[PDB]
């Protein structure tokens, strides 16, 4: 029942090709943030240039090619405003973005956690787009683009009714510490991490 002993790659910088279904190989470079306890094949990765956190079975997915774990070391970045950061956690927020034409575009959301590994970054999700995002929110805050407002189900299966008249099954993979009724869900055949209040 043996398997090749591997270095734990959480915290590592990686790069790899990805075989698009009936398409070209695309190239990806990112940071491994986490290895999911209930499914150790599954990693959460923040890719450079992509706002969404993705979940991939990096060593198992046959679409991954030329996976390279880099020696590049992620900086042990001390937190500038530990106080401000710590208090944003679990808070509802109004997060200001910019449109194509530069017009304002405000999104209601919730700050979930400081991200592991890239710890000047934050986990955040949105009321109108409930997947896991990741930004350096202290920057948005300082620039006035982030306004703050005043048992575990992990391991269980959930079914969601797809808007295109269909159903799918996911696993509850993580409980948000600051808000224990909020969980991360991973569905098969979807790379996004869904964030739902399960109470």
């Amino acid at each position: 029942p043996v398997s090749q002993p591997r270095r734990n790659i959480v915290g590592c910088r990686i790069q790899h090709g990805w075989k698009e279904g009936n398409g070209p190989v695309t190239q990806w470079k990112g940071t491994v943030l986490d290895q999911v306890p209930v499914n150790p094949s599954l990693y959460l990765i923040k890719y450079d240039g992509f706002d969404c956190v993705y979940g991939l079975e990096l060593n198992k997915d046959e679409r991954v090619s030329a996976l390279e774990v880099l020696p590049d070391r992620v900086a042990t970045s001390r937190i500038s405003d530990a106080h401000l950061a710590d208090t944003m956690i679990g808070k509802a927020v109004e997060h200001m973005f910019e449109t194509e034409d530069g017009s304002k575009d405000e999104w209601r959301g919730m700050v979930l956690a400081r991200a592991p590994v890239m710890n000047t970054w934050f986990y955040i999700t949105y009321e109108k787009d409930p997947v896991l995002y990741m930004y350096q929110l202290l920057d948005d805050y300082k620039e006035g683009d982030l306004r703050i407002m005043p048992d575990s189900l992990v391991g269980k299966q959930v079914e969601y009714a797809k808007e295109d008249g269909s159903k799918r099954t996911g696993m509850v993979i993580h409980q948000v510490e600051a808000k224990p009724s909020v969980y991360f869900i991973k569905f098969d055949d979807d790379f996004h991490i869904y964030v739902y209040d399960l109470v």
């Binding site: 992509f50 706002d51 969404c52 200001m96 973005f97 910019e98 449109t99 194509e100 304002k104 575009d105 999104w107 997947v131 930004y135 948005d140 620039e143 683009d145 996004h192």
Partner: peptide, 8 residues
Amino acid sequence: ARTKQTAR
């Protein structure tokens, strides 16, 4: 402010 990525 940040630019929203329309695809993801």
